[PDB]
């Protein structure tokens, strides 16, 4: 029958979808959500054998264990155990596009388990098996007898095993197919794996059972009154003595309870549902649920007889909240939301796509700690525990159907075909039937990148009909089709339009006011965080805050999809597309997270945290104005700390408790501060500290901060005259300067400071030269597909122009002796194919104090692509343990991504001055730096810099971080100017004009001296 | 043009149509109809079927047609004749002046139906003036109303021809049979004959 | 697999639906809507045999005409030929309401046709068969090989027979089931045939 090559057959003998069940036979256990003796886990060690195709599977496998099989842990993806390679491809399908057919060589995983089943489970009731996640299709056998079939790798497939089991030992046989017609709806840009990767368990339900229940909460205008409505469905024989009681609990207090026999109201000419009943409970002054304060109640649904005999009980957490779009705004409990979200795949570097509670909790804590209040389930229903945690910790969730057909041409070829409507409908309907009771889910998504087809409109309407409590959204076909209540573009820019034909990405500010448009706009994806990214992030938030209908978005994305591999020594290293022999592959494009695979933050995380702060500030005179962006809570766990420092040196500080109501403001008058003595710039730095611990953070947690330049006193004091006068030694080949035991050597041939001595120890391994290039960032490379060679990308334009090939040609090199110093004047031209790209003119002034004043004036030909940077670089002969600097920090920060950094005195070990991006590139830069200290060296001025054991050349030529080797000495890059890193997307030039070095003529000065 | 979907015998009527497990089977009866007949100028209105109550599957298929073929209005009578699955109020046997306030699915008099708060759609009875036997009394009342009220745009009489079958007696002469004459049981007897003309097309 | 008791399976190997085709190889004929040589009718005399259930159908029938069968005209409702009785019920289903199951005693009509096909049709192109109406479900065989399945009594079911036909004589075998899960969607107030 080859059911795995037929979109008409998405399952066989599969039970109906429903909300989480546990079949408690005790109500208190249901109330407290404790383990149920009726819900057994079958996770653990299973038997496993791998086959090249389903036709290679021996019939004997159905009757008994294959000796050739191994014992492995379940859940798991078999690629993670080494049976075959995991494949990383973005758009292009991992298989030949020929729906509904899949390759004849179809990796087949045969799972089997021998287990016991208590006789008590078979003497009465129904025993079913539950597979929470099987990728991508499978056949089931119990004791050699065929049971059923199932598709959709992201939702549970349940089967009745009542007639298949026997008291004692039993054996299951599961044939998991890697590829199936379902694979055509699962073309998400992620690793392609397979197997039983989610839980497997047995559930025993009585014959007369609760087969489904829906919980709805409606409110009056001011939310002071609520009605909890619970519809309950049952299966089995209807009896007049049967009853359903629904009780609502607030902690250990019972708030309300209602009982009633079965039999619903009249529906149509034929009657009503005799097997259903709806309980309505009144609730006064309900504690409302929100991401801010996740208030929760517990609803227990008991099925019982009139004489008080419990048959079974189910239950769920209930969050009282209303979600609705009104007059163009997405409102929660009547307040307009501002979505600080992020897309999040279920990925683990060792276990692949298998999710565990610990990793989930770790992600949520890190998310809330970094000011995120929402998550999009890109691009499929998640492990059932995710929703429970988001309900309890408080995060708004966009639950998304497992449907992506990106590799089709056009994208909507399948979604506009009615023959695929059935398969698509199940991926949407079974998601809703499963997650509809979770308060954390506030929006339904029809899928991702499947263009826009008629099948979308049908399913959109289906949701709106069965569940009017949640808005529905979908980005395909232009982000504003008739299948979405929300304009949800991906990578649409703030001010710049991208007028693509048919599916244009208008700037978000413009999109809102297009003739006739009235819907709110929330980007489903934005600020692509691939590698050194998030440049321009602050631009989005300034817009989100200014425009009511711009209600945020979800950053792409949370965690790098890198996998752990081990070298000969057994040392682990991070791998990406193509490191498993997988091909075609899209290499490093699977890594776009704010955090590394092991959850260590990327520098970009701090920028997001800062921009997504819930408190805003304005300074006026001595008054700090604090505005709360919380919609429901007062600042009852916040105190503001302020600090004033003169160039890093603390002068005054203090703290005032914060007491601002949601959306309110507070004025904090700073005490009179004694004006500083010495010259310099005074800086005010405020930060919000939460004194008390919470479910998501520790005491002392910093949730927000901001800085302001205060008074500055320019230095007018003339330095005391020097004691000695530097001496100039002119030779045919050099210009050497002597002063004490210090020496400076300038090569008259190259025209660069080739060497500098302190005593007799050389300070440089490589001369000090200009540098106008950088090891390309993921954004500079600009490709989402390894097969695309984009000429328009920055790196390609830089190479073509010869920036990476340019060579300095000495135009001038003279030396003069001044009354108290030596002046070396030079001029260089950088050319490529007879074209002068850059002209750099410098002057070096070394005086009696041993300080070398370097002035650099650069010319950049207007018709050459704007350079990555304008500065100098050299390889210092020495290596120190610390790096001290007065500037923006402490973390890596670039021109278009430095709002989170603070000007102050920072001191870190050399290693922290290097960011371990899996795919090496320019990194570790720090801007607004006025002083840099390293070893015995000190550089002063107004520059940007990075310092590490890796030259731009090595980073540029090494594809993986684990292959980098520390070079002798220390590489120093000091830039007068540096181009933005961009990030609006990573497959087209994204550096905003204001951050491009297009001025033509640049000037910067650096003083180099001994410390 | 009407999809082959009628689940009248269910309790309640929408038991299958509000069940997503039956959405596939239902979608094929609607989608394959549209793909076959969309080029015929005679077809001016699509129908989602008959007497299947009103379920979510109806709303889904209703929108599917509106999306693939905007040139024709879509109508459906199940669930009250005025649900979100129909562009036309299309009751069956709703009377001209007399209301029939059935619970949940009332059949208002057609003149009153048009003006209910918020109602704006045209009204065309998908079925009316049941011509079973000596019938059609009051027919003229409908037409006086159709002519006076702009939004009352007619209807479809039920129905065209008796569903009687030919049987033969001892002499071998033909006679007109109805429910139960073939030993079929249970059966609803003469209720299959509601036409304006006899089975042989002779006028009533 | 009892495909007639599974609303999840409404057809097997059925071609996409589409507007009326005639495949003219002459435009003038297409303009005047004249008969097309590429569209052959298979209406006429067929071989038919009635069975109380699909389980009673002998395997021999798949590759050889049953001698007990009669020659009947098609299209036709078998109740009209007297094989069993037509049923008239208004609202109440003629079968026990227990979706998606139907009675085990499911009147089965076995149709077969021996017909010719010219090599010119098989040497090039696609040859498909079209059933404009089959009540209410059926399995199709061609020269003893299973071809497909179909439901919905009021729309055409088309199947590609290009790989099952041969030059010369060919034999179709169609097993039509009176009841199927599709019957649950066909409870119109009319005779049940
Ligand atoms: O548009 C997109 O951009 C991302 C690029 O990393 C990723 O492929 C998402 O799944 C896709 O929706
Ligand atoms: O409401 C109806 O009335 C008629 C009674 O003869 C017939 O049963 C139609 O099919 C049905 O829609
Ligand atoms: Mg399939
Ligand atoms: Mg994609
Ligand atoms: Mg700032
Ligand atoms: Mg079927
Ligand atoms: Mg009826
Ligand atoms: Na806004
Ligand atoms: Na990606
Ligand atoms: Na406080
Ligand atoms: Na690199
Ligand atoms: Na009128
Ligand atoms: Na009738």
| Atom of ligand 1 minimally distant from the CA of A490 | 1
- The rounded distance, in Å, linking the Cα atoms of A289 and A439 is 8
Residues 6+ apart with CB under 8 A from A992: A496, A535, A536, A539, A896, A980, A982
Q: Are strands A253-260 and A242-250 parallel, antiparallel or unpaired?
A: antiparallel
| A550-555 and A521-526 beta bridge pairing | parallel
Q: Which helix (H) or strand (E) holds A190?
A: strand A190-192
Specify the pairing of strand A742-747 against strand A734-739.
Answer: antiparallel
**Helices B56-68 and A454-466: angle between axes, nearest 10 degrees:** 150
Q: Distance, CA B76 to ligand 7 centroid (Å)?
A: 14
Contact of A642 with chain B, judged by CB distance below 8 Å, is answered with: no
> Which chains would you list as touching B if contact means 3+ CB atom pairs under 8 Å?
A, C
Q: Which of A186, A426, A449, A892 is catalytic?
A: A449
Sign, CA torsion C40/C41/C44/C47: positive
Distance separating alpha carbons of residues A92 and A189, to the nearest angstrom = 9
Ligand 1 binding site (Cβ under 6 Å of any ligand atom): A 90, 188-189, 378, 448-449, 490, 525, 556, 592, 784
Whether residue A532 contacts residue A778, with contact meaning beta carbons closer than 8 Å, is answered with: yes
Q: A930 in the Ramachandran plot: left (φ > 0), alpha (ψ -120 to 50) or beta?
A: alpha
Q: With b meaning 16 or more CB within 10 Å and e meaning fewer, what string describes B89-105?
A: bbbbebbbeeeeeeeeb
**CA distance linking residue A96 with residue A103, whole number of Å:** 7
Choosing from A568, A588, A612, the residue where a domain stops is A612
Beta carbons of B94 and B108 less than 8 angstroms apart: yes
Which residues lie at CB < 5 A from ion ligand 6?
A: C 3, 6, 9, 181
Q: What is the resolution of this structure in A?
A: 2.2
Query: Does residue A836 sit in the same domain as residue A723?
Result: yes
**A660 Cα to the center of ligand 10, angstroms:** 8
Strand partners, A665: A627
Residue A333 zone, left/alpha/beta (φ > 0; ψ -120 to 50; rest): left
Structural method: X-ray
What Å distances lie between residue A169 and A129, A139, A204, A296, CA to CA?
Answer: 16, 21, 17, 42
CATH number, domain at A759? Answer: 2.70.98.10
> B91 contacts in A (CB within 8 Å)?
none
Same domain, A884 and A1001: yes
Phi and psi at A409, nearest 5°, equal: -135, 110
Q: Please count the helices (runs of H) and the strands (runs of E) in chain B.
A: 4, 6
* Distance in angstroms between the alpha carbons of the first and the last residue of chain A: 81
Residue of chain C whose alpha carbon sits nearest to that of B193: C190
Q: Which atom of ligand 2 is nearest to the CA of B192?
A: 6
List C residues 9-68 in contact with A (Cβ-Cβ < 8 A): 9-12, 16
Domain end position, chosen among A167, A186, A206: A206
Find the angle CA(C17)-CA(C21)-CA(C27) to the nearest 5 degrees: 150
Which residue pairs, CB below 8 angstroms and at least 24 apart, start in B133-142? B133/B190, B133/B193, B136/B196, B138/B96, B141/B96, B141/B97, B142/B96
Residues A923, A1006 within the same domain: yes
Tokens of A718: 């003339």
Indicate whether A764 and A644 sit together in one domain. Answer: no
Nearest by CB to residue A462, choosing from B15, B59, B68, is B59
Q: What number of H helices and E strands is found in chain A?
A: 13, 60
Residues of A in contact with C148 (CB under 8 A): none
Q: What share of chain A is helix, strand, coil (3-state, %, to 5)?
A: 15, 40, 45
Q: Which residue of B has its CA nearest to A11?
A: B21
Q: Look-up: residue for tokens 């298929």?
A: B61
* Distance from C-alpha of B52 to C-alpha of C124, rounded to nearest angstrom: 46
DSSP codes of every residue in A197-255: -S-EEEEEE-SSEEEEEEEEEEE-TTSSEEEEEEEEEEES---TTEEEEEEEEETTEEE
Assess whether the previous peptide bond of A531 is cis (omega < 30° from 0): no
User: What 3 state SS string does A12-25 have?
Assistant: ECCCCCCCCCCCEC
Task: Tell whether B183 is within 8 A of chain C (Cβ).
Answer: yes
> How many structural domains is chain C composed of?
1
The count of CB pairs under 8 A between chains A and C is 12
Check CB contact under 8 Å for B31 and A421.
yes
Q: Could you tell me whether strands B74-75 and A937-948 are parallel, antiparallel, or unpaired per DSSP bridges?
A: unpaired
Closest Cα of chain A to C10: distance in Å?
Answer: 8
Q: Which ligand is nearest to the CA of A488?
A: 1
Q: Compute the nearest-CA separation of C145 from chain A (Å).
A: 14
Active site residue B127: yes
User: Which of B10, B15, B17, B64 to probe by mutation at the A interface, max A CB count within 10 Å?
Assistant: B64
Burial track A488-526 (b if 16+ CB lie within 10 A, e otherwise) = bbbbbbbeeebeeeebebbebbebbeeeeeebbbbbbbb
Q: Are residues A808 and A956 in the same domain?
A: yes
Substitution target in C3, C21, C151, C185 with the highest count of B β-carbons within 10 Å is C185
B13 to chain C: closest CA residue:
C91
Same domain, A105 and A244: no
The verdict on the CB of residue C59 being under 6 Å from ligand 2 is no
Beta bridge partners of B92: B127
Helix/strand/coil (H/E/C) assignment for every residue in A727-774: EEEECCCEEEEEECCEEEEEECCCCCEEEEEECCEECEEEEEEEECCC
Could you tell me the end-to-end alpha-carbon distance of chain C, in angstroms, rounded to an integer?
Answer: 24
A201 with A308, same domain: the answer is no
C-alpha A748/C-alpha A810 separation (Å) is 9
Please give the distance, rounded to the nearest whole angstrom, from the Cα atom of residue A694 to the centre of ligand 10. 14
Give CA separation, A181 vs A164, A400, A420, A580, B27, in Å: 28, 20, 10, 25, 20
CATH number at residue B45: 3.20.20.80
Q: Is residue B52 within 6 Å of ligand 2 at its C-beta?
A: no
Q: Among A183, A206, A229, identify where a domain stops.
A: A206
Cα angle A637, A640, A645; round to 5: 155
Place of tokens 């997307």: A985
**Contact present, B192 and C191 (Cβ < 8 Å):** yes
Give A-chain residues touching B57 at CB under 8 angstroms.
462
- Tell me which residue of A292, A323, A289, A319 sits closest to A663, measured CA to CA: A292
Distances (CA, A) of C79 to A934, B168, C175, C193: 100, 15, 16, 6
Please give the annotated binding residues of A for Na(+), written as ranges: 189, 589, 592
Neighbouring CB atoms inside 10 A of A995's CB total 20
A301: tokens are: 């649904």
B51 labelled catalytic: yes
Q: Could you say which of B2, B28, B51, B119 is catalytic? A: B51
Are the beta carbons of B23 and A270 separated by less than 8 Å?
no
Q: Which ligand is nearest to the CA of A590?
A: 9
CATH number at residue A300: 2.60.40.10
Do A495 and A372 reside in the same domain of the chain?
yes
Q: Is C112 on the interface with B (CB under 8 A)?
A: no
What 8-state DSSP symbol labels residue C31?
H
Q: Is the domain of A759 the same as that of A879?
A: yes
**Which structural domain, as residue segments, surrounds residue A499?**
322-612
Distance from the alpha carbon of residue B123 to the mean position of ligand 12, in angstroms: 9
The Cα B50–Cα C90 span in angstroms is: 13
By C-alpha distance, which of A247, A229, A227 is closest to A303? Answer: A247
């Amino acid at each position: 029958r080859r059911d795995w090559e037929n979109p008409g057959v998405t399952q066989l003998n599969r039970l109906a979808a429903h909300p989480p069940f546990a079949s408690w036979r005790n109500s208190e256990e249901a109330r407290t959500d404790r383990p149920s003796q009726q819900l057994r886990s079958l996770n653990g060690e299973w038997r496993f054998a791998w086959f090249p195709a389903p036709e290679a599977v021996p019939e004997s496998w159905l009757e008994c264990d294959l000796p050739e099989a191994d014992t492995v842990v379940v859940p798991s993806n078999w690629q993670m155990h080494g049976y075959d390679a995991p494949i990383y491809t973005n758009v292009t399908y991992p298989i030949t596009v020929n729906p509904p057919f899949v390759p004849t060589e179809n990796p087949t995983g045969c799972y089997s388990l021998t287990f016991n089943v208590d006789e008590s489970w078979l003497q009465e009731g129904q025993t079913r098996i539950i597979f929470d996640g099987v990728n991508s299709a499978f056949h089931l056998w119990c004791n050699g007898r065929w049971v059923g079939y199932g598709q959709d790798s992201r939702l549970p497939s349940e089967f009745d095993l009542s007639a298949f089991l026997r008291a004692g030992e039993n054996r299951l046989a599961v044939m998991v197919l890697r590829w199936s017609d379902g694979s055509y709806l699962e073309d998400q840009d992620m690793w392609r794996m397979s197997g039983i990767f989610r839980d497997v368990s047995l559930l025993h339900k009585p014959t007369t059972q609760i087969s489904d229940f829906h919980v709805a909460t409606r409110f009056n205008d001011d939310f002071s009154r609520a009605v909890l409505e619970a519809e309950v469905q049952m299966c089995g024989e209807l009896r007049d003595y049967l009853r359903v009681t629904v009780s609502l609990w607030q902690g250990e207090t019972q708030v309300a309870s209602g009982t009633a026999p079965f039999g619903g109201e009249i529906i149509d000419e034929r009657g009503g549902y005799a097997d259903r009943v709806t309980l309505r409970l009144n609730v006064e002054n309900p504690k409302l649920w929100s991401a801010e304060i996740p208030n929760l109640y517990r609803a227990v649904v008991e099925l019982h007889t009139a004489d008080g005999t419990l048959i079974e009980a189910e239950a769920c957490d209930v969050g009282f909240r209303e979600v609705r779009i009104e007059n163009g705004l997405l409102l929660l409990n009547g307040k307009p939301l501002l979505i600080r979200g992020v897309n999040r795949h279920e990925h683990h570097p060792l276990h692949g796509q298998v999710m565990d509670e610990q990793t989930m909790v770790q992600d949520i804590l890190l998310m809330k700690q970094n000011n995120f209040n929402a998550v999009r389930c890109s691009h499929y229903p998640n492990h059932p525990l995710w929703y429970t945690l988001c309900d309890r910790y408080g995060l708004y969730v966009v639950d998304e159907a497992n449907i992506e057909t990106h590799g089709m041409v056009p994208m909507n070829r399948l979604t506009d075909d009615p023959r695929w409507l059935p398969a698509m409908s199940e991926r949407v309907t079974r998601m809703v039937q499963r997650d509809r009771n979770h308060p954390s889910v506030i929006i339904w998504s029809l899928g991702n990148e499947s263009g826009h087809g008629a099948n979308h409109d049908a399913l959109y309407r289906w949701i709106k009909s069965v569940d009017p409590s949640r808005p529905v959204q979908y980005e395909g076909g232009g982000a504003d089709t008739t299948a979405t209540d929300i304009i949800c573009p991906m990578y649409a820019r703030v001010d710049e339009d991208q007028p693509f034909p048919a599916v244009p990405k208008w700037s978000i500010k413009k999109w809102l006011s297009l003739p006739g448009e009235t819907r709110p706009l929330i980007l489903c994806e934005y600020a692509h965080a691939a590698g050194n990214s998030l440049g321009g992030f602050a631009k989005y938030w300034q817009a989100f805050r200014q425009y009511p209908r711009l209600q945020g978005g979800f950053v792409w994305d949370w965690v790098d999809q890198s996998l752990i591999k081990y070298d000969e020594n057994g040392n682990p290293w991070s791998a990406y597309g193509g490191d498993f022999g997988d091909t075609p592959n899209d290499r490093q494009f699977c890594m776009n997270g704010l955090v590394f695979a092991d959850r260590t933050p990327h520098p970009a995380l701090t920028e997001a945290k800062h921009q997504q702060q819930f408190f805003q500030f304005r300074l006026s005179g001595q008054t700090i104005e604090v505005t709360s962006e919380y919609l429901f809570r007062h600042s009852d766990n916040e105190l503001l700390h302020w600090m004033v420092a003169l160039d890093g040196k603390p002068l005054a500080s203090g703290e005032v408790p914060l007491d601002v109501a949601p959306q309110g403001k507070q004025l904090i008058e700073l005490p009179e501060l004694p004006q500083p003595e010495s010259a310099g710039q005074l800086w005010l730095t405020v930060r919000v500290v939460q004194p008390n611990a919470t479910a998501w953070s520790e005491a002392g947690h910093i949730s927000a901060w901001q800085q302001w330049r205060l008074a500055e006193n320019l230095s007018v004091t003339l330095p005391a005259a020097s004691h000695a006068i530097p001496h100039l030694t002119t030779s045919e080949m050099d210009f050497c300067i002597e002063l004490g035991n210090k020496r400076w050597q300038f090569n008259r041939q190259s025209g660069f400071l080739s060497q500098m001595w302190i005593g007799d120890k050389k300070q440089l391994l490589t001369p000090l030269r200009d540098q106008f290039t950088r090891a390309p960032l993921d954004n500079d490379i600009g490709v989402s597909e390894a097969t695309r060679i984009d000429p328009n990308a920055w790196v390609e334009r830089w190479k073509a122009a010869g920036h990476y090939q340019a060579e300095a040609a000495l135009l001038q090199c003279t030396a003069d002796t001044l009354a108290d110093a030596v002046l070396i004047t030079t001029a260089h031209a950088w050319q490529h194919q007879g074209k002068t790209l850059f002209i750099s003119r410098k002057t070096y002034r070394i005086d009696g104090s041993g300080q070398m004043a370097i002035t650099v004036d650069v010319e950049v030909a207007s018709d050459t692509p704007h350079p990555a940077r304008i500065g100098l670089n050299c390889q210092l002969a020495q290596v120190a343990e610390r790096v001290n600097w007065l500037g923006l920090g402490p973390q890596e920060n670039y021109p278009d991504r430095l709002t989170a950094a603070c000007f102050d005195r920072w001191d870190l070990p050399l290693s922290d001055m290097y960011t371990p991006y899996v795919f090496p590139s320019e990194n570790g830069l720090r801007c607004g730096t006025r002083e840099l200290n390293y070893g015995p060296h000190q550089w002063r001025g107004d520059f940007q810099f990075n310092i590490s054991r890796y030259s731009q050349q090595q980073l540029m030529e090494t594809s993986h971080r684990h292959l980098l080797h520390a070079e002798e000495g220390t590489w120093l890059n000091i830039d007068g100017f540096h181009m933005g890193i961009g990030g609006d997307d990573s497959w087209s030039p994204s550096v905003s004009a204001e951050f491009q070095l297009s001025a033509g003529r640049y000037h910067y000065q650096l003083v180099w001296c001994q410390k």
